[PDB]
Amino acid sequence: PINVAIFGSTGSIGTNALNIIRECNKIENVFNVKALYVNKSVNELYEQAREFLPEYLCIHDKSVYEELKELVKNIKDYKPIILCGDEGMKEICSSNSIDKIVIGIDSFQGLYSTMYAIMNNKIVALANKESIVSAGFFLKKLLNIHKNAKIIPVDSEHSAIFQCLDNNKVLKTKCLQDNFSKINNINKIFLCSSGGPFQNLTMDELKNVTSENALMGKKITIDSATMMNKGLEVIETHFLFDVDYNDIEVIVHKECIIHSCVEFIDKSVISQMYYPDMQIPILYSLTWPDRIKTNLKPLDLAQVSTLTFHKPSLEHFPCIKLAYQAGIKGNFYPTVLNASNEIANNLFLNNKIKYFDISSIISQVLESFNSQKVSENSEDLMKQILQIHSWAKDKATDIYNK
Amino acid sequence: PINVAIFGSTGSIGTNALNIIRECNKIENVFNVKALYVNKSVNELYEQAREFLPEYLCIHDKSVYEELKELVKNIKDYKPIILCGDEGMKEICSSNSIDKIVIGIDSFQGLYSTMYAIMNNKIVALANKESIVSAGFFLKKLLNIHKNAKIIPVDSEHSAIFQCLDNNKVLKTKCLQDNFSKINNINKIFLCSSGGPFQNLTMDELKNVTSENALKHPKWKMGKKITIDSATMMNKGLEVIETHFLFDVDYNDIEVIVHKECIIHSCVEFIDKSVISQMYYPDMQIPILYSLTWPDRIKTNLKPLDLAQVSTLTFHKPSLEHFPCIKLAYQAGIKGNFYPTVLNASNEIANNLFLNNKIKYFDISSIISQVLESFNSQKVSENSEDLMKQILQIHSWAKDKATDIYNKH
Ligand SMILES: NC(=O)c1ccc[n+]([C@@H]2O[C@H](COP(=O)([O-])OP(=O)(O)OC[C@H]3O[C@@H](n4cnc5c(N)ncnc54)[C@H](OP(=O)(O)O)[C@@H]3O)[C@@H](O)[C@H]2O)c1
Ligand SMILES: CN(O)C(=O)CS[C@@H](c1ccccc1)P(=O)(O)O
Ligand SMILES: CN(O)C(=O)CS[C@@H](c1ccccc1)P(=O)(O)O
Ligand SMILES: [Mn+3]
């Protein structure tokens, strides 16, 4: 029996997590939903608490803490432990009745729950790429201290990579550890991309696209359009699997059947395939190193018929190159990249800047950043990341305001 | 350091095996070639003995035993143990200085070396599909007796399937063992096929194709027998049965898929419905290497797969009307008993008849069908030696029956 807590349960990731748990429990009682955690969606959480009856309920916004208490009681025969804010978050992570934690909180924010889950030596099913990109060094340091804690990737491409690996080798190491690619005999990674909605547009057409043309969460949807998502996923790949940037190739695969591929040192390539869906990577992160039966629609390769692959144009998608450059430079440049992107993404979402202004703002912030001495100790490293994150957001806003 | 013997070293598999060993040895000394074995190609064996200097040389044909002795003389600082026939084959398999045996002997003949390799608890890198199809039951029984022996698949599609599995689960079982697919969480297998040279022909055009049309242009130099089997898709039918025995997968869970680009070599659907596939250019060096490095991988200097360059991958269902051999293989597999032995033996005759322009394309399937129809299931022998003789007799019977049907025309 696998005891699970879902963080950000009303979100895209959270809903899909409960969907696959529900379906798999119809076949065999494998999962127990022990805790649910949201921001302010009280009504949606009440509805989820009805079906799964978790031991713990938690909401971040304390102002809606009373509303949740009233909605619970009429559910007969249930008394849950209702908690709030960061302290409730911490109590869930320290519980001995929980083995695996799904982090479905979006943006840089998700880092707090990730660290507490690691500190308590839990399996962390991490969908939040932002925390890996801004705080890869910090997570690596933390996973070194808390030796039983593990991050299992949920982002579809990184889940595919992880599925392609030999668990006989994976068990000798873990994600976000030095030497991961050497132990797993990894030579090269093909990181597949849908290409997003703007893939077939000219430079002239690109220069006038809007948020409407681009519009998953609204944030990841814009990132998909600029191919900044794939840029962030390159850095994510580097941290999770210890693969060199010169060994990661972005490939546009518009059918989204092959989710990513791993080239091993003998040059044999292994890839994971399925329909575009998040239930598989969520499930695997919870069943690893085993697999369990599902009633999901089987892949029909004859029906799919055709799979295509081509290189992305770096001229049309300058965000990709910026992410490689920030990754290669190392230090806190990926933190800066992520923070400046958050601002520029939102400005484009609200029709304040143009498409090529996104990469332009990000480039200027990166140029203005100077490498910093990396703090030796974990608490000081975390504060450093927060300050540099904050600085880069402010810098990006300032470039916009001039 | 991995000590290897190559059986059928001058053939297509054998040459590709020595090619990848040579290349890998330039990076680091990982392989030692301990023995080479051929049928009658003395001159090609001498040339191979020059480069690899194996401890053992063996040839089956005793009439060219004297010619080899004189030639090894040209090669200096080399005094190898030169052997002959089945006896020499057995001495190589019983040597303690050999860990892995590559079986690249073609046809039903390859079964003898396969059994002695198993009897001596060796790792057997088996490319010969005929032995698995005619004697799957026997090999399963033999692997149960010799618990340290393992067959590692070399046939590209079966190697791909094997590469797609988690070695953390593979190590708890072995190929050709009951419950293999349950332990490995296998739900379904996509068995990819090139489709061969006749894939886009109509029924009318098929009805008049010849061995020349089938042989002229392959991906690489393959044997004449496997080329014809490729053209009729009987190769894939044999590979279906091979998949069933190697991985304990039900026939209703094996789907043949035509993939003309031959980049994806096969796919495994697991019980959660996630699919894993192995990809590379069409080449035998990878599956040969992996069979010798398993459960590890080693560095090569092979050309990296360029997916953007490949650009397009296509998939479609094969037409059973155009390729009746596929259905016949399923039917023989499903019936079980010695029907796959009969299928293989009748095909060997019909393949050769079509190769020598004696029968037409559809006559291949017609002769095989008639032989299968005439066969009655036999009580399966309990003991391994008697089972082997039973297989040989049925093999022989089916070849004679196929020739007899041909002669009543
Ligand atoms: N060719 C491929 O790419 C490929 C791919 C998958 C599977 N396979 C399978 O692998 C096997 C080999 O195929 P192939 O194309 O390499 O055939 P091949 O090119 O014609 O080579 C056959 C080899 O076996 C040797 N041999 C034959 N009979 C023997 C006997 N009674 N005793 C000792 N040695 C004997 C031959 O010796 P001589 O040279 O002295 O005549 C030769 O070295 C077949 O089962 C084939 O279907 C092959
Ligand atoms: C799913 N998943 O990990 C994303 O990251 C969402 S966005 C990516 C995607 C992937 C699959 C379908 C559509 C879009 P991208 O367009 O390739 O960046
Ligand atoms: C290599 N390999 O496993 C064979 O079995 C040889 S024949 C097959 C093949 C597969 C790949 C390229 C060419 C030919 P088929 O045409 O799909 O049967
Ligand atoms: Mn992704």
Ligand SMILES: [Mn+3]
């Ligand atoms: Mn094959």
